[PDB]
Write a protein that binds this ligand. Sequence first.
Ligand code: CU1
Ligand code: CU1
Ligand code: K
Ligand code: K
Ligand code: K
Ligand code: K
Ligand code: K
Ligand code: K
Ligand code: K
Ligand code: K
Ligand code: K
Ligand code: K
Ligand code: K
Ligand code: K
Ligand code: K
Ligand code: K
Ligand code: K
Ligand code: K
Ligand code: K
Ligand code: K
Ligand code: K
Ligand code: K
Ligand code: K
Ligand code: K
Ligand code: K
Ligand code: K
Ligand code: K
Ligand code: K
Ligand code: K
Ligand code: K
Ligand code: K
Ligand code: K
Ligand code: K
Ligand code: K
Ligand code: K
Ligand code: K
Ligand code: K
Ligand code: K
Ligand code: K
Ligand code: K
Ligand code: K
Ligand code: K
Ligand code: K
Ligand code: K
Ligand code: K
Ligand code: K
Ligand code: K
Ligand code: K
Ligand code: K
Ligand code: K
Ligand code: K
Ligand code: MG
Ligand code: MG
Ligand code: MG
Ligand code: MG
Ligand code: MG
Ligand code: MG
Ligand code: MG
Ligand code: MG
Ligand code: MG
Ligand code: MG
Ligand code: MG
Ligand code: MG
Ligand code: MG
Ligand code: MG
Ligand code: MG
Ligand code: MG
Ligand code: MG
Ligand code: MG
Ligand code: MG
Ligand code: MG
Ligand code: MG
Ligand code: MG
Ligand code: MG
Ligand code: MG
Ligand code: MG
Ligand code: MG
Ligand code: MG
Ligand code: MG
Ligand code: MG
Ligand code: MG
Ligand code: MG
Ligand code: MG
Ligand code: MG
Ligand code: MG
Ligand code: MG
Ligand code: MG
Ligand code: MG
Ligand code: MG
Ligand code: MG
Ligand code: MG
Ligand code: MG
Ligand code: MG
Ligand code: MG
Ligand code: MG
Ligand code: MG
Ligand code: MG
Ligand code: MG
Ligand code: MG
Ligand code: MG
Ligand code: MG
Ligand code: MG
Ligand code: MG
Ligand code: MG
Ligand code: MG
Ligand code: MG
Ligand code: MG
Ligand code: MG
Ligand code: MG
Ligand code: MG
Ligand code: MG
Ligand code: MG
Ligand code: MG
Ligand code: MG
Ligand code: MG
Ligand code: MG
Ligand code: MG
Ligand code: MG
Ligand code: MG
Ligand code: MG
Ligand code: MG
Ligand code: MG
Ligand code: MG
Ligand code: MG
Ligand code: MG
Ligand code: MG
Ligand code: MG
Ligand code: MG
Ligand code: MG
Ligand code: MG
Ligand code: MG
Ligand code: MG
Ligand code: MG
Ligand code: MG
Ligand code: MG
Ligand code: MG
Ligand code: MG
Ligand code: MG
Ligand code: MG
Lengths: 78, 64, 52, 96
Amino acid sequence: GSTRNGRDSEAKRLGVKRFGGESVLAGSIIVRQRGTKFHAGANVGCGRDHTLFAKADGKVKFEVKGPKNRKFISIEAE
Amino acid sequence: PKIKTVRGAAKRFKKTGKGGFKHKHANLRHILTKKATKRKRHLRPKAMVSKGDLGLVIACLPYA
Amino acid sequence: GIREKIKLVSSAGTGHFYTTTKNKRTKPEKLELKKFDPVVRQHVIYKEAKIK
Amino acid sequence: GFEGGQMPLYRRLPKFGFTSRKAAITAEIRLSDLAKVEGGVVDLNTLKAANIIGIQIEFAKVILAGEVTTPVTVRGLRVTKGARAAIEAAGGKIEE
RNA sequence: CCUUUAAUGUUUGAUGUUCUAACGUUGGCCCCUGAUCGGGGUUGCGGACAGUGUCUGGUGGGUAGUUUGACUGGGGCGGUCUCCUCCUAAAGAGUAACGGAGGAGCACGAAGGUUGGCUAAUCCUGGUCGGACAUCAGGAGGUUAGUGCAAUGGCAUAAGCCAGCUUGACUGCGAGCGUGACGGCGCGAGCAGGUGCGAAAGCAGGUCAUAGUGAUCCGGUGGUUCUGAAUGGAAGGGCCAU
RNA sequence: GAAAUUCCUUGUCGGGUAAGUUCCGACCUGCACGAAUGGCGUAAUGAUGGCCAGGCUGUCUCCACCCGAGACUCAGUGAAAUUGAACUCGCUGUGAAGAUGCAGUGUACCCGCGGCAAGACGGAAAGACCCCGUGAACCUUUACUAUAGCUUGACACUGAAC
RNA sequence: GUUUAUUAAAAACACAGCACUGUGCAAACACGAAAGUGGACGUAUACGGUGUGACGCCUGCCCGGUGCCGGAAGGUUAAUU
RNA sequence: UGUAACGGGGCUAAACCAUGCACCGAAGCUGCGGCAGCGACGCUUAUGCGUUGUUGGGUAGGGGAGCGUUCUGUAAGCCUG
RNA sequence: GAGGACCGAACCGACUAAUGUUGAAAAAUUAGCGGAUGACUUGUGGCUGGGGGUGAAAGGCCAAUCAAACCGGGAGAUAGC
RNA sequence: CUUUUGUAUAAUGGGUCAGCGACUUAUAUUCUGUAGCAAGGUUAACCGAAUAGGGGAGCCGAAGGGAAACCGAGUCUUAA
RNA sequence: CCAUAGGUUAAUGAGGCGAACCGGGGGAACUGAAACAUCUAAGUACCCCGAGGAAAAGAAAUCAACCGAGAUUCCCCCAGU
Ligand SMILES: [Cu+]
Ligand SMILES: [Cu+]
Ligand SMILES: [K+]
Ligand SMILES: [K+]
Ligand SMILES: [K+]
Ligand SMILES: [K+]
Ligand SMILES: [K+]
Ligand SMILES: [K+]
Ligand SMILES: [K+]
Ligand SMILES: [K+]
Ligand SMILES: [K+]
Ligand SMILES: [K+]
Ligand SMILES: [K+]
Ligand SMILES: [K+]
Ligand SMILES: [K+]
Ligand SMILES: [K+]
Ligand SMILES: [K+]
Ligand SMILES: [K+]
Ligand SMILES: [K+]
Ligand SMILES: [K+]
Ligand SMILES: [K+]
Ligand SMILES: [K+]
Ligand SMILES: [K+]
Ligand SMILES: [K+]
Ligand SMILES: [K+]
Ligand SMILES: [K+]
Ligand SMILES: [K+]
Ligand SMILES: [K+]
Ligand SMILES: [K+]
Ligand SMILES: [K+]
Ligand SMILES: [K+]
Ligand SMILES: [K+]
Ligand SMILES: [K+]
Ligand SMILES: [K+]
Ligand SMILES: [K+]
Ligand SMILES: [K+]
Ligand SMILES: [K+]
Ligand SMILES: [K+]
Ligand SMILES: [K+]
Ligand SMILES: [K+]
Ligand SMILES: [K+]
Ligand SMILES: [K+]
Ligand SMILES: [K+]
Ligand SMILES: [K+]
Ligand SMILES: [K+]
Ligand SMILES: [K+]
Ligand SMILES: [K+]
Ligand SMILES: [K+]
Ligand SMILES: [K+]
Ligand SMILES: [K+]
Ligand SMILES: [K+]
Ligand SMILES: [Mg+2]
Ligand SMILES: [Mg+2]
Ligand SMILES: [Mg+2]
Ligand SMILES: [Mg+2]
Ligand SMILES: [Mg+2]
Ligand SMILES: [Mg+2]
Ligand SMILES: [Mg+2]
Ligand SMILES: [Mg+2]
Ligand SMILES: [Mg+2]
Ligand SMILES: [Mg+2]
Ligand SMILES: [Mg+2]
Ligand SMILES: [Mg+2]
Ligand SMILES: [Mg+2]
Ligand SMILES: [Mg+2]
Ligand SMILES: [Mg+2]
Ligand SMILES: [Mg+2]
Ligand SMILES: [Mg+2]
Ligand SMILES: [Mg+2]
Ligand SMILES: [Mg+2]
Ligand SMILES: [Mg+2]
Ligand SMILES: [Mg+2]
Ligand SMILES: [Mg+2]
Ligand SMILES: [Mg+2]
Ligand SMILES: [Mg+2]
Ligand SMILES: [Mg+2]
Ligand SMILES: [Mg+2]
Ligand SMILES: [Mg+2]
Ligand SMILES: [Mg+2]
Ligand SMILES: [Mg+2]
Ligand SMILES: [Mg+2]
Ligand SMILES: [Mg+2]
Ligand SMILES: [Mg+2]
Ligand SMILES: [Mg+2]
Ligand SMILES: [Mg+2]
Ligand SMILES: [Mg+2]
Ligand SMILES: [Mg+2]
Ligand SMILES: [Mg+2]
Ligand SMILES: [Mg+2]
Ligand SMILES: [Mg+2]
Ligand SMILES: [Mg+2]
Ligand SMILES: [Mg+2]
Ligand SMILES: [Mg+2]
Ligand SMILES: [Mg+2]
Ligand SMILES: [Mg+2]
Ligand SMILES: [Mg+2]
Ligand SMILES: [Mg+2]
Ligand SMILES: [Mg+2]
Ligand SMILES: [Mg+2]
Ligand SMILES: [Mg+2]
Ligand SMILES: [Mg+2]
Ligand SMILES: [Mg+2]
Ligand SMILES: [Mg+2]
Ligand SMILES: [Mg+2]
Ligand SMILES: [Mg+2]
Ligand SMILES: [Mg+2]
Ligand SMILES: [Mg+2]
Ligand SMILES: [Mg+2]
Ligand SMILES: [Mg+2]
Ligand SMILES: [Mg+2]
Ligand SMILES: [Mg+2]
Ligand SMILES: [Mg+2]
Ligand SMILES: [Mg+2]
Ligand SMILES: [Mg+2]
Ligand SMILES: [Mg+2]
Ligand SMILES: [Mg+2]
Ligand SMILES: [Mg+2]
Ligand SMILES: [Mg+2]
Ligand SMILES: [Mg+2]
Ligand SMILES: [Mg+2]
Ligand SMILES: [Mg+2]
Ligand SMILES: [Mg+2]
Ligand SMILES: [Mg+2]
Ligand SMILES: [Mg+2]
Ligand SMILES: [Mg+2]
Ligand SMILES: [Mg+2]
Ligand SMILES: [Mg+2]
Ligand SMILES: [Mg+2]
Ligand SMILES: [Mg+2]
Ligand SMILES: [Mg+2]
Ligand SMILES: [Mg+2]
Ligand SMILES: [Mg+2]
Ligand SMILES: [Mg+2]
Ligand SMILES: [Mg+2]
Ligand SMILES: [Mg+2]
Ligand SMILES: [Mg+2]
Ligand SMILES: [Mg+2]
Ligand SMILES: [Mg+2]
Ligand SMILES: [Mg+2]
């Protein structure tokens, strides 16, 4: 006999690229994600594939804010 | 006898001032409607040959 | 793959064209859009034509 | 260039450009070359006589490279802006 | 001298008949000649046919040169081969098996941009036809709905639903970054030009995101302040779009 | 017609035998006979295939004796394959997984000669099976690409008249 | 009768007989760039090719496929022009 | 195939548990002597010397430094009846 | 006095068995076996040549060689083994 | 010895000795060392009786960018 | 019938051999392309004809580029352009 399985897709290398406290340059990707598990905070942008990236030089900061206890990433100016 | 150039490589690489090679990007010959303008625009300028490929290019082009 | 390629030709006479696709069975009417012509550097009307 | 059978680099990239016959008969002249000719007049013939340009060169351009410290007359060549400034400052002249 | 229409000296076309002089003769006779070869002569038969050369369509295992994939708990047979989603995967990334499960090879000038507005499923009760389920009203409920199509991650400030105006599904670029052995692929503020929506702050370089794909060569089409084998052109080539 | 064909199958029935997967005669349920890549018969023929019987016998029960030629001893002549090196035992275990050579243990004074082949994965031939190599050959064909031959027409050699 | 000289002698090959088919003679056919030669100093009661295989009784149905044979009104189609 | 499921002998501990102190045991560590690689610190006749720390198992393979053989020059020299 | 008639030596074969298998022999010996006036057998000489011959057909045979002889050459073919 | 994940292996090769038996040669190219000269370096064929000397035809280097025309310490891109 | 073909005689020449080099008529495949057909190997190997001490080629219906060169042959560059 044979199997009807045997397929998969290539790994997409998502996840956090710069962790809390890391110094980054403007433009740096901070996290790659499907949809907004993390949300964009101060000095952070959200791209068309929901990548969060730095809009200014500084240090990465994660926090939980708002009425829904959501996770936000911001850049602290250094 | 004299080493023979690989003529096909000579048609696709040119040596630059510090000794690298410039080349034309792939993917801009046809099937163009379905590609974004940003992608095509970034394929238009010539690029440099990568470090892992420099050896193959140099082997093909002894008189470059 | 029923959608067919088409070109949108500038009305400014520059020869500039964009390309796109169209479902010709459901929308037989010609596509017409204002788009930027980089030759004359203005937005003008562009009209559907055959792809070539 | 063989890579094990994968389309090799020199064939997965595209060809580009054309080769210009006029480039093969055009040469560049340095400022330091100007004093090397015989007689103080720089033209195609005197450069060829001094072995500065090849026998089949039909067009030459003087560029700002090296220095000129003597008055020279340049005749029938193209001169860059910087080279023209250097030649005139050294006391020469450029004739079309 | 223009529309049209009859005929021949007259040019080649196809058919048919006749002719002889090219050409055939493995019919008779004569000579070279002591010769069933050959040649010449003569006569009969055939005759512009046949046959051969060059070109050309068909047929052509008669003959030739070759091809006839890989993975694989041996090979064959069967199944598979690129792309996307989950799990295996050991809480960063990555991670194998002919391991466990599903999808793609598109769709859309609106299903895209923007401004303004809105909020689901399901059930209960009352109500003409009307019923288990149509539309109406109220209540409960709180996303159990929805998302153009798998699955996962998302989504109320909605990314879900409705409407007005529209073409940013713009052109040139791009700090910086991600991901690849490489070819490549991806995210991206911001700058110049021109544009749509909004009073405005602003948003817009396609679509909730992640599949919807094919290098190079060879050529085709349009454009072009490039090239142009003596020179001016042209052919061909380059560059840009396709 | 269960066959030079029948898988199931030693089909089933009859015959022959004490007993018959073969044989002979039938049945037909012909996996998958069949009419000139002939069907069904057929006297004669066959170093042809199968089966039965009489005769015959050392084929056998079950071997015995004998006659010769070797084998064995003496004299003369004088090979071979093979061979890393050998001071070249058994057993149980171990271990590239079936040991003369390791471990433990048992047995064993040194050396010939006639015999036998259980082992030295004994000798012989770079496995012929199987797989692999982008190896070979020769064969096939409605595989691909060609091509001799065969066939078509145009022009030439090739002319006249109606 | 023949055969795998050297592991197969046979039920294989051949065979007389049978049929189909080609061939009008410079025969078809075969060897051969060709000239020629065989076929044959033969001429359809002859010669080649193919299948079957003494003899006896026989040899049924199918021409849709592939081939061969005939047809040539039409469609398509080469060089050439 | 033969004890053949402590390696054997043998063992009632020479078995097992617990506690303790001795000892044996390797190319490990130390002692004594020697050689080499690398690095520091100083001398120096600038390429060796001294002091010091440390290193020195190796297949594919990379790097370094040498032995010997024949032939040419040095050599009509030098050794050799 | 016919006959691919019959029995059977020479002659031509090669069905069975034993032996032999570093042979007496690179295919034989021994005991038996088939044909033996024929499509028989044999001597001498001739002819056919390698994608070619010849083949009562076994891919048989073509000098102890045959699904393409032997010799020389391309030639140190190529060999991811 | 070889080959291997791994061989006392009952995997391979060798009866023994002696002699022979396998990374070369030419040209081109790049890198290292070393020597000469140095913004220069060097000649080829050839001439020459000449390892001299002549011969600088040439080749490499002192400039790049651009498909190219072209511009040039800049240039290309683009209307910028 | 003139003739021609044919026949006889005489004079002169040719033929055959040889290692390479040379001109001409024909002309592979292995191989490489990591398969293979275009292509390559290569106008090579090989077969054939002919010459000479050499052969062949040779006195522009050639190049160049608006300036000029001035038959053929051979060597170094140009340029692995
Ligand atoms: Cu036609
Ligand atoms: Cu003669
Ligand atoms: K006649
Ligand atoms: K004719
Ligand atoms: K033809
Ligand atoms: K054929
Ligand atoms: K497996
Ligand atoms: K297995
Ligand atoms: K995971
Ligand atoms: K919209
Ligand atoms: K809208
Ligand atoms: K990259
Ligand atoms: K063009
Ligand atoms: K020219
Ligand atoms: K052009
Ligand atoms: K039956
Ligand atoms: K049957
Ligand atoms: K029975
Ligand atoms: K038949
Ligand atoms: K019959
Ligand atoms: K028989
Ligand atoms: K019988
Ligand atoms: K032992
Ligand atoms: K034995
Ligand atoms: K293959
Ligand atoms: K063979
Ligand atoms: K027989
Ligand atoms: K036979
Ligand atoms: K007949
Ligand atoms: K009969
Ligand atoms: K009869
Ligand atoms: K039929
Ligand atoms: K038919
Ligand atoms: K027709
Ligand atoms: K030391
Ligand atoms: K001496
Ligand atoms: K005879
Ligand atoms: K044959
Ligand atoms: K022979
Ligand atoms: K052959
Ligand atoms: K070995
Ligand atoms: K091995
Ligand atoms: K092995
Ligand atoms: K073995
Ligand atoms: K070996
Ligand atoms: K070198
Ligand atoms: K050097
Ligand atoms: K510019
Ligand atoms: K070939
Ligand atoms: K190959
Ligand atoms: K092959
Ligand atoms: Mg995944
Ligand atoms: Mg293009
Ligand atoms: Mg010069
Ligand atoms: Mg005659
Ligand atoms: Mg074939
Ligand atoms: Mg071949
Ligand atoms: Mg396979
Ligand atoms: Mg299959
Ligand atoms: Mg993970
Ligand atoms: Mg982990
Ligand atoms: Mg791993
Ligand atoms: Mg792995
Ligand atoms: Mg997998
Ligand atoms: Mg599928
Ligand atoms: Mg809104
Ligand atoms: Mg950058
Ligand atoms: Mg602006
Ligand atoms: Mg406004
Ligand atoms: Mg798009
Ligand atoms: Mg949408
Ligand atoms: Mg979507
Ligand atoms: Mg082509
Ligand atoms: Mg011209
Ligand atoms: Mg011109
Ligand atoms: Mg049976
Ligand atoms: Mg039975
Ligand atoms: Mg019975
Ligand atoms: Mg029966
Ligand atoms: Mg039958
Ligand atoms: Mg049948
Ligand atoms: Mg019939
Ligand atoms: Mg039949
Ligand atoms: Mg039949
Ligand atoms: Mg029969
Ligand atoms: Mg019968
Ligand atoms: Mg017989
Ligand atoms: Mg004796
Ligand atoms: Mg064991
Ligand atoms: Mg054992
Ligand atoms: Mg003995
Ligand atoms: Mg014995
Ligand atoms: Mg053996
Ligand atoms: Mg083997
Ligand atoms: Mg083959
Ligand atoms: Mg015979
Ligand atoms: Mg035999
Ligand atoms: Mg026999
Ligand atoms: Mg005849
Ligand atoms: Mg004839
Ligand atoms: Mg004849
Ligand atoms: Mg038959
Ligand atoms: Mg019909
Ligand atoms: Mg017909
Ligand atoms: Mg026992
Ligand atoms: Mg013990
Ligand atoms: Mg204790
Ligand atoms: Mg010790
Ligand atoms: Mg130690
Ligand atoms: Mg010490
Ligand atoms: Mg150590
Ligand atoms: Mg060591
Ligand atoms: Mg000496
Ligand atoms: Mg008889
Ligand atoms: Mg015989
Ligand atoms: Mg006998
Ligand atoms: Mg008889
Ligand atoms: Mg007899
Ligand atoms: Mg031959
Ligand atoms: Mg056979
Ligand atoms: Mg023989
Ligand atoms: Mg062959
Ligand atoms: Mg060769
Ligand atoms: Mg060889
Ligand atoms: Mg193994
Ligand atoms: Mg061991
Ligand atoms: Mg042993
Ligand atoms: Mg061994
Ligand atoms: Mg081996
Ligand atoms: Mg051995
Ligand atoms: Mg080497
Ligand atoms: Mg330059
Ligand atoms: Mg001669
Ligand atoms: Mg090949
Ligand atoms: Mg060639
Ligand atoms: Mg002579
Ligand atoms: Mg001459
Ligand atoms: Mg001449
Ligand atoms: Mg003139």
